[PDB]
Amino acid sequence: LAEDPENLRWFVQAELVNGRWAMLGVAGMLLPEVFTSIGIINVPKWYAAGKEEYFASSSTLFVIEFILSHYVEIRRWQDIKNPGSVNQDPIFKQYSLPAGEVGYPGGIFNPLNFAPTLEAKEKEIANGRLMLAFLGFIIQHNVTGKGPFDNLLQHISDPWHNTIVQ
Amino acid sequence: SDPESLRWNVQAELVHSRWAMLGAAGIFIPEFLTKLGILNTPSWYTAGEQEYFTDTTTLFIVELVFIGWAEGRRWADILNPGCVNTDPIFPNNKLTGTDVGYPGGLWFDPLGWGSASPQKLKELRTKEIKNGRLAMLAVMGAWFQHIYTGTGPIDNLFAHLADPGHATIFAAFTPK
Amino acid sequence: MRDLKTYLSVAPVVSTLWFGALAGLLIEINRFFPDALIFPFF
Amino acid sequence: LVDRDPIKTSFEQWAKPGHFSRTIAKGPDTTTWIWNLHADAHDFDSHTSDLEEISRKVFSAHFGQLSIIFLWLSGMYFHGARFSNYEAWLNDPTHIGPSAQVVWPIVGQEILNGDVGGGFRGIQITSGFFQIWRASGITSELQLYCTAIGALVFAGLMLFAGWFHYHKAAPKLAWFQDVESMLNHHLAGLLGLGSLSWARHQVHVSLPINQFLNAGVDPKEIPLPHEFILNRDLLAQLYPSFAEGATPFFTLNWSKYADFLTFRGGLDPLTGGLWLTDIAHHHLAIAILFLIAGHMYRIKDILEAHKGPFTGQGHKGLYEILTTSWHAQLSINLAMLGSLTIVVAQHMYSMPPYPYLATDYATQLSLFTHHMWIGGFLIVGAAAHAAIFMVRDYDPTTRYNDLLDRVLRHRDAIISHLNWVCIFLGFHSFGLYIHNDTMSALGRPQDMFSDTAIQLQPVFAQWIQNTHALAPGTTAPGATASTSLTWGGGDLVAVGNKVALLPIPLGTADFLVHHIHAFTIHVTVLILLKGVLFARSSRLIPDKANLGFRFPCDGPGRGGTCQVSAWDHVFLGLFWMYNSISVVIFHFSWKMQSDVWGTINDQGVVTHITAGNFAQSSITINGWLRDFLWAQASQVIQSYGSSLSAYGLFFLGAHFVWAFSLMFLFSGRGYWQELIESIVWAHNKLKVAPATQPRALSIVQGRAVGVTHYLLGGIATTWAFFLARIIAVG
Amino acid sequence: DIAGLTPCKESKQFAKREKQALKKLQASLKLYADDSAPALAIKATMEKTKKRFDNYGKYGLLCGSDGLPHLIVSGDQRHWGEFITPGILFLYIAGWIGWVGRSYLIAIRDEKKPTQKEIIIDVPLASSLLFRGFSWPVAAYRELLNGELVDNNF
Amino acid sequence: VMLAFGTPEKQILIEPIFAQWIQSAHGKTTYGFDIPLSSTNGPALNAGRNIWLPGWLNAINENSNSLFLTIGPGDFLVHHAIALGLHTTTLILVKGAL
């Protein structure tokens, strides 16, 4: 019987988690970029480490890291239903305990607050979308080629290309 | 006993009509001033000098971005404030309706007398040619078909045919 | 001329300008790719 | 109603919830009404008590149709011009195998379109223009493209005369309900002034422009386009400028002539249409009559006159009404219009009237079965609408005490007979066949009924057929052969691939089909006759006319009390007629190919599409699927991957649609309700149904969706079965 | 690979199908368009089914016997998008037929009487509602399970 | 529609696994597979073998009189149209009853 604007703790959290991981992902590229250096999916096996052991399959490195990742991840689902994180930085974020205004249900637009400091992460929000939908682009453009820019005496024009196969 | 048009998007239909016709304005004077070609004569090289061309389509995206923003934002506000929901003033949303869109926010507002207006004084200039332009364009755009079709040469396509005696064009004139 | 929270009406079978057409533009995808039975992607 | 009455709204009503019978569509929502209203969009109980307009509406609806035919057939005549087949065929006829129509190639489509032609891919046609057509002499594709727009002219105008009625402020009573002239005019100068006018453009122009086509040329090597007036040198051949007669009459001399005419009898050789020259004379000799005839007259006068002792007082003022029933003066008509269409269906196949038909087999049997289903689809109607009379149309009683009031007087009587008639037939009219099976499967031919076995012995020959050709003992003069070539006496000789036309001699095994027709024609009519007669009140219900000719059925009591009514007599009477015609068709082609449709070969040894298999083998009613359905139809179920293929590819659907009808025909009604809710439930859980109360079919709608499907199913099945066994061998 | 014999790369039986059939539809020696501008077996209808070729794509594609293709659709080898690729597609499209079914419906029942709005249709296709359907991410897939249509609405 | 369109190709037929698969478990024998973790032997059954299933319930593939005949796209339809039978037949009996 209750009309609108339900959502709550809800999935404001989901997006922001997308923004924060999108930003990190982009950093995972980032890397070559000035010394053109290394490229693309790479499928790397990541940084290395330096060799005595491997040849390297060496087991499933991910499967393991990821079992651990997995009870950090629960910790967060927990918090979100009923909350405890000492910093308390997504759920509201810091400046913490309030967000009371969300906690008892029903806000409808609300902007929000955070940190003992100030400048309300509305500036992290942006730096954060761009990185959302930046993967979007980045992932899209593979299918074809690695690299962007720098110079024209020839490069900018996009004089001849592949298409999609049909 | 007669249809009822009156139709009611409508007043909009007339402002749509201004877009079409004022825009229709660009065409005539410039192409035709045409350079009264021309003293003589016209060369592009320059940009496109040899850069693998200039526009093709890419020219069309820029054309549109520049525009999208404008055509888009736009009618979005020729006007329209209030902007929600339940029941009718009819414009068709009408939301702006009673509230202009704002009591007390700002100067949304332009000018004296709790109003939008530039004010009373002028139909003058621009109802007669600008709408006369509704007319103008149509016949002169109707003139464009007249001016190319018949394609002198190149293409008959699919004939049951049965012309020639002679070609069609524009330079101007008419013969006859 | 139509803003926010539903608009103007329409007749009994504008479905006959919806079966014919829309749907019609689809033969228009079934000759652009004159064929299917699986499909490449984009 | 009142959105807003009278005087003071131009303003139209679109909206506020809309109309019929006074607890008008509720407000509150339903489905059925969307099915109501297409149905019984005109009945005329409702709109007004008083006939007032309606005659002022039915003139307009008529205009719409006349246009529409016109929209049609401009289309057709188009199609016919600019997808030509025709120019090509006509130099070429009897080679060609003709199309107007082509697909475009999208997806599968185009298996369909397979070389027809003077060298183009086609869908082969079996309605013939290209034969209506032969007549135009002048020729060429862009005209027919004028005859075409000449069509779209008549239309827009013969469609703005329908604006120029009802909608325009428009007419009143006297104009129909003073009849006094109307046939006077109609039959006189149109019936007349067409056939007349048709004469003038049926020797002027057509005769000459196929008088020297029946040789070859590349047309226009023959005919200039206007060519044909003040001029005429050309008439000179095909005869004289009357040279010195005067306005017919006599003080005339022929030592050798008599004006164009000169009657034909028999068929052209090398175009076996029949002579293009009795075609002027006959139409001329028509019109006159009509020209004289439509000159009666003003009425009761003649009808009120003769009476007899059985005979009917009623005959007199046999209807002040008639002028204003309508529903009755349509019902009468349909019987005639309808019964006057399938009389076409004979005179056609046993006397072609267009150049190149018979040789053209498939392009005049399609015909003889299309024209055949109308001279039937319009007859059961011609009963329905009498039932619509018999129940309602006049406010009040004052028809009184006649001829009708007479017929009804007996009624458990006229239909008391007719009944036994049918069981006498049926037993003499079908179990007759079943003898054969039961005894040829027992197997003892000595005693079958075979044309050989039970003795008439080997002649059909003399009844009428043999007196009919043999014709000139007579006050008869004329013409080397017959009125119809088929009749027994005369001729080998007709046509150039092929046989067109030959005696057809019957015997038995034409004897007993001819009788199943009787019994089929008869029990059809029983149900319609007893249906329309017992229209209003019955021994089972008296309170019987009270809503309806429609009502579903009165109610579970009286034992049954279901079918009754007369929508339903015109529901179970269609059901038969679908046979009546469906088995008459089955008759003609099995004959016309088992015998007649032919080939000629050196020394003329005739080779019938089937060497008369009919002989001893239709008489067995399995032979009717041994020799028919399983024999022919092998072309339907072989037809895949071809050009016609759309038949084999229909023949499954529509041979499906039929076997979907039974579901609509054979089932309850609060059933699909009882079901429709389980549905409606599941619907509400997700929140997705209630609004516009979804409802099952309206008892009699369910019957409407029987029947109608049972027919467009069971029918096009053969429309496919056919076009698939004349295209290709035959 | 899984029983029906293997793809394009070889399916003789399949090859024989390519050839006879179409190639004969050819085998009307001519029928004449030596210039002539219209009749199109000639060009494509064959060639559009024909420049089907040792290529088709490639597509794998199983070809039973008589070398007509059979579709396994297992999650293997080549074949995955002969059901899922065009499967989720069917799902996504439908459901955004009826997500808006449960929409230019749950928007009325309301105000001053709404007894048959439905047979005329302000705005057509709802439209407004329409795009809700592509702008479902998740959409019903959580909201149907929680709140709105909610067990109580159940 | 496809056929008699004269493209037979571009027919849609599923060669319908689910049965063929039952009847690997049993067998044999048509052209192998391993089927990961049977493999056409290695893992044989091992717990069971020469006792029980012997030569019996081994016609294998066997056109003449196998027991099991070798199922394809023709059978992935009738088998879905016997299934549309007892379902419809029972929505009406289930209903009829309820």
Ligand code: CLA
């Ligand atoms: C010259 C006469 C002609 C005329 C002018 C009329 C006029 C009339 N008839 Mg009528 N009728 C006729 C011939 C005619 N009939 C014939 C030949 C028959 C015998 C079949 C009938 C049997 C008949 C019945 C049983 C009824 C009428 C009724 C009526 C009245 C209702 C009209 C209506 O709502 O349309 C009705 C038309 C529709 C609702 C359209 C549906 C058509 C469907 C069945 C399609 C047909 C199949 C076709 C292949 C489908 C198209 C192709 C598709 C597959 C794509 C009206 C006064 C009705 C009445 O109650 O009297 C007041 C009554 O229902 N008629």
Ligand code: CLA
């Ligand atoms: C509700 C179901 C309907 C019914 C009554 C049946 C019944 C049958 N199928 Mg079957 N099938 C169906 C739908 C159905 N199927 C669908 C939609 C597919 C995919 C096209 C299949 C694919 C299939 C194969 C390959 C085979 C069968 C077979 C069979 C028969 C043997 C037992 C079996 O394998 O069940 C099949 C059971 C299922 C497929 C479980 C799902 C049941 C439906 C109700 C859930 C709907 C899921 C949805 C449509 C797909 C998910 C989306 C997508 C992303 C995957 C049996 C008569 C076998 C057989 O003996 O053929 C001769 C075997 O060959 N089926």
Ligand SMILES: CC1=C(/C=C/C(C)=C/C=C/C(C)=C/C=C/C=C(C)/C=C/C=C(C)/C=C/C2=C(C)CCCC2(C)C)C(C)(C)CCC1
């Ligand atoms: C005054 C005048 C006049 C008049 C003129 C006119 C106007 C005329 C006409 C003419 C006409 C007026 C004609 C008509 C004709 C008609 C017809 C010829 C009919 C038809 C039809 C059809 C063809 C149809 C058919 C069909 C059928 C069979 C049925 C149904 C189907 C269909 C439709 C197909 C005159 C001349 C003296 C001159 C002087 C002045």
Ligand SMILES: CC1=C(/C=C/C(C)=C/C=C\C(C)=C\C=C\C=C(C)/C=C/C=C(C)/C=C/C2=C(C)CCCC2(C)C)C(C)(C)CCC1
């Ligand atoms: C999946 C789906 C579907 C389905 C489809 C199908 C499955 C179908 C079918 C169908 C069938 C399975 C059958 C049908 C048939 C039809 C018909 C058939 C129609 C019509 C007709 C006509 C047009 C006719 C005409 C005629 C005349 C003139 C008279 C008589 C004769 C004839 C009949 C010839 C669709 C896509 C739809 C939708 C979506 C989903």
Ligand SMILES: CCCCCCCCCCCCO[C@H]1O[C@H](CO)[C@@H](O[C@H]2O[C@H](CO)[C@@H](O)[C@H](O)[C@H]2O)[C@H](O)[C@H]1O
């Ligand atoms: C959350 C649960 C689901 C919600 C669905 C139920 C909706 C509630 C329905 C309203 C119940 C009856 O309410 C009813 O009383 C009102 C006042 O007493 C009346 O209201 C009327 O009288 C007023 C007097 O000035 C006028 O200003 C109002 O315009 C007029 O509507 C109406 O007759 C009706 O609105």
Ligand SMILES: CCCCCCCCCCCCO[C@H]1O[C@H](CO)[C@@H](O[C@H]2O[C@H](CO)[C@@H](O)[C@H](O)[C@H]2O)[C@H](O)[C@H]1O
């Ligand atoms: C089908 C069962 C036969 C029962 C009916 C037989 C009785 C009549 C005899 C045969 C009927 C066919 O009639 C046919 O006779 C001859 C075949 O021999 C052919 O005879 C034709 O061919 C020759 C060419 O100059 C000449 O012999 C004739 O002058 C000519 O009429 C004809 O094409 C046709 O007129």
Ligand SMILES: CC1=C(C/C=C(\C)CCC[C@H](C)CCC[C@@H](C)CCCC(C)C)C(=O)c2ccccc2C1=O
């Ligand atoms: C099967 C059957 C039904 C059930 C048949 C029904 C309910 C047919 C009505 C179905 C309608 C035509 C579906 C209409 C829905 C669509 C038109 C709406 C969406 C619009 C589209 C764009 C798809 C009866 O109601 C019935 C009544 C009396 C005697 C026999 C029978 C009978 O045999």
